[PDB]
Design a protein around this ligand. Structure first.
Ligand SMILES: CNC(=O)c1cc(Cl)cc(C)c1NC(=O)c1cc(Br)nn1-c1ncccc1Cl
Ligand SMILES: [Zn+2]
Lengths: 281, 447, 146, 49
């Protein structure tokens, strides 16, 4: 029922939201200094987990060009100065694994220890074209110093996206709800070009799905798919059962009984993946 | 035996791991020994008539086959219990889904009772280990929630097999491996794998291999596996029984028209039906009509040039201009026309099935798989086909959406996430669009 | 041109130069192009034609050794159902060929030694390999032409 | 696709086609993401700078 959004739009919610979002983008500027600063910062980001589902719910029954949808995005120009930070924070730690993915940035210090010095990486990151000048040594200070001679990017890597695996997908959802909902508007278009990285990283984990509802008012809903069931649906244990039932929805099926068979098809396939994941290695 | 009890399922795991390639080599080595089978010869001399093998300057050709054949039978055993190891849940799951569907919705066994499967499905409800291989195992009590108001409870509880129902409904609310096993449910699901089409054919594949060691030459029927293995050559043998229902009766017409047409030759034209060129040894076949009819269906539907070419030339005046009507009214009927019907009812049906083999390819290539909008109006948007095919109206992402709503709790789901599930469980599906998706009347505010 | 300098070794290899008419005009290019247009299934169904008669000849090689003989000389008998490699070449030489069964190369079954079984044998050769599976090879050329 | 790798490094590659500055606008295209010294030797520019 959209009757809550009559008062929640006109009253005093959204300046409180920008007052939360400023400190939300400003807390992890200093709570990345030391290794003892993360088990409470991840408490703050699974508060961000519900901060995004706060305004995910105002997209329910979303009129395409509605004043509620415009008052969703005048948020980010009343608070334009605290969104670039939270959009580039999910980019400065997610191209992190893309630094190691090239072999040219791997063979710098070929020591068998794994302690590459900080100065050997600073001038190396200054040579790439996907970086910012004054934004090198601050994330070096966010990394472990250890007398400025130890990086250990194996633990620089896997620790800072363990709380940024669940919030990054939903802020990608937040940027992709509004791109196709409100069209032809200038200043809500630049920041998806500035934050297309998490969208590109979550291209396999994103899905656009439509359900008819609320007396003929259809609007799209987004969902998440896990990496375990991602790479295993593309196997010939099931990709030919695909065509096995594709052949028989027009050969014998009618118009009124076509998806009544398809839902049993999906549950039988997820049943054989239940037993196949049991006997999997 | 705990060191072996998980070791044998570990054996069965890498047994079923490479099932497809193991079946492929099981086909090809049988093909190879059926190829080396091409060099057998029989003569009256001992190595009465003894079947020996012909070889040129090689000695181990014959002791290879006696191990290759047992290899083929052993890998036949391997693929049989591999079939019964991986995919008996496919022949398990859907028909008790069908059974619970008619228990909850229609009332197939309580409101009425009906074939070949409907009364064999009554040896599965009363055992307590019925729903042990399907997700919903409270199916025996919501049928009592459904129709515990119209009928008697004490009869339906004994019919559905709830042992101490009113005691267990309070107990579950408040608070020698084969000896505990059932005797009826396992033989009930042992009947269905013999009933269904695939397992009896795969057992027919192995009932010849142990028989193949009695005489080596019955391995030739294993080369008909090519006909049903590929789908391209499956439609040729499937086209005969696709229109056999009229073809057996019109070949019965072929059987009765010549049976009509041969009694007039058996009675009035007894003179000339003779192929014996010996004058002293005459054996005509128009003496018994059971012999004459076997003769007539041996040459008349056969030769393609009438019937009077087995019979010498009518140089005599004894009914000369009547046999020239006889032969051509055999000719115009049984080779010209009624053989061309049997040609047409095979070749046309071949054409119909191969054209509908790829009009479904046309349907996947043009239609939508969700709703009833064709691809002709997606032509104004440049390459608007794949942006609608891969992500929005996709076949895999909807079953992923059905996946991710099962594991986590419904104290997490939203208004739309409960909207999509609370009538999914009672199974009514007007929730798909079926007429409007992103294009019809959303074009007025689309730039 | 690799045939023309070779054509002076023996004069009669100039005959393959008359197949230039087939690919030169576009009207008669589609006839030779129609075979490889649907050869991808035709080679495998003529493989079906090759294996069905290879299935069908071992029962004559084992159980019907009596009558497969075309040698009319009594003192010089040479039947071809002694080696099945000879019998299979014989069977694909006459059975897909004659168009009237297989038992016209073989004399008449006047004897009672499995009389009503060879009349099933010959017509289950006849209904399969000339009536049907030759008409598939006819259709997959003429339809594709159309 | 791999027989087409014996045609880039020779200086007489674009001599039979109209546009013969094709080896430098690829460096204008993707001289920002990769190394220049590798792609110049791979495309065969002798003394490019
Ligand atoms: C329909 N016959 C079978 O099921 C079958 C059953 C048994 Cl017991 C053994 C074999 C070799 C079988 N034959 C195949 O299994 C098979 C034949 C052909 Br031709 N192809 N093919 C195949 N198809 C898909 C994956 C791997 C393979 Cl090998
Ligand atoms: Zn659609």
């Amino acid at each position: 029922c959209t009757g809550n959004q009559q008062s929640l739009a006109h009253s005093r919610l959204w300046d409180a939201v920008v007052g939360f979002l400023h400190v939300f983008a400003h807390m992890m500027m200093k709570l990345a200094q030391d290794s003892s600063q993360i088990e409470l910062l991840k408490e703050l980001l699974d508060l961000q987990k519900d901060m995004v589902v706060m305004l995910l719910s105002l997209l329910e029954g979303n009129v395409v060009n509605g004043m509620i949808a415009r008052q969703m995005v005048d948020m980010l120009v009343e608070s334009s100065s605290n969104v670039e930070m939270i959009l580039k924070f999910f980019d400065m730690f997610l191209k992190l694994k893309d630094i190691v993915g090239s072999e040219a940035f791997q063979d710098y210090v070929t020591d068998p220890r794994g302690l590459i010095s900080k100065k050997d990486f600073q001038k190396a990151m200054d040579s790439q074209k996907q970086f910012t000048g004054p934004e090198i040594q601050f994330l070096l200070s966010c990394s472990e110093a250890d007398e400025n001679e130890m990086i250990n990017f194996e633990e620089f890597a896997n620790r800072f996206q363990e709380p940024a695996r669940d919030i990054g997908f939903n802020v990608a959802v937040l940027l992709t709800n509004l791109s196709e909902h409100v069209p032809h508007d200038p200043r809500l278009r630049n920041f998806l070009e500035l934050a297309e990285s998490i969208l590109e990283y979550f291209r396999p984990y994103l899905g656009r799905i439509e359900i008819m509802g609320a007396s003929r008012r259809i609007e799209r809903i987004y969902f998440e798919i896990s990496e375990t069931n991602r790479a295993q649906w593309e196997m010939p244990q099931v990709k030919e059962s695909k065509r096995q039932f594709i052949f028989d929805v027009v050969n014998e099926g009618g118009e009124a009984e076509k998806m009544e068979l398809f839902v049993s098809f999906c549950e039988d396939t997820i049943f054989e993946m239940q037993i196949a994941a049991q006997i999997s290695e | 035996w705990g060191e072996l009890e998980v070791q044998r399922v570990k054996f069965l795991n890498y047994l079923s791991r490479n099932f497809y390639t193991l079946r492929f080599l099981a086909l090809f080595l049988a093909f190879a020994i059926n190829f080396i089978l091409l060099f057998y010869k029989v003569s009256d001399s001992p190595p009465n008539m003894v079947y020996y093998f012909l070889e040129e300057s090689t000695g181990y050709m014959e002791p290879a086959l006696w191990c290759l054949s047992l290899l083929h039978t052993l890998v036949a055993f391997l693929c049989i219990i591999g079939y019964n190891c991986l995919k008996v849940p496919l022949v398990i799951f859907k028909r008790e889904k069908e059974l619970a569907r008619k228990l909850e919705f229609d009332g197939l066994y309580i409101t009425e009772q009906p074939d070949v499967k409907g009364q064999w499905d009554r040896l599965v409800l009363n055992t307590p280990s019925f729903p042990s291989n399907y997700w919903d195992k409270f199916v025996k009590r919501k049928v009592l929630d459904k129709h515990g108001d119209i009928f008697g409870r004490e009869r339906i509880a004994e019919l559905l097999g709830m042992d101490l129902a009113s005691l267990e409904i309070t107990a579950h609310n408040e608070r020698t491996w084969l000896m505990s096993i059932d005797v009826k449910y396992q033989i009930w699901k042992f009947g269905v794998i013999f009933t269904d089409n695939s397992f009896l054919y795969l057992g027919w594949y192995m009932v010849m291999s142990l028989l193949g060691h009695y005489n080596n030459f019955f391995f030739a029927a294993h080369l008909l596996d090519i006909a049903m293995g590929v789908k391209t050559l499956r439609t040729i043998l499937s086209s005969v029984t696709h229109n056999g229902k009229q073809l057996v009766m019109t070949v019965g017409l072929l059987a009765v028209v010549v049976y009509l047409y041969t009694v007039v030759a058996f009675n009035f034209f007894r003179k000339f039906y003779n192929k014996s060129e010996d004058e002293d040894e005459p054996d005509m076949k128009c003496d018994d009509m059971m012999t004459c009819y076997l003769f007539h269906m041996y040459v008349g539907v056969r030769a393609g040039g009438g019937i009077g070419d087995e019979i010498e030339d009518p140089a005599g005046d004894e009914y000369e201009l009547y046999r020239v009507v006889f032969d051509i009214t055999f000719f115009f009927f049984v080779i010209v026309i009624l053989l061309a019907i049997i040609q047409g009812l095979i070749i046309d049906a071949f054409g119909e099935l191969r054209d509908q083999q790829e009009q479904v390819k046309e349907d996947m290539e043009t239609k939508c798989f969700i709703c009833g909008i064709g691809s002709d109006y997606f032509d104004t948007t440049p390459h608007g086909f794949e942006t609608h095919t891969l992500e929005e109206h996709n076949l895999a992402n909807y079953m992923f959406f059905l996946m991710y709503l099962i594991n986590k709790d419904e104290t997490e789901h939203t208004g739309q996430e409960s909207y999509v599930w609370k009538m999914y469980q009672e199974r009514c599906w007007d929730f798909f669009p079926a007429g409007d998706c992103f294009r019809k009347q959303y074009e007025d505010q689309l730039s």
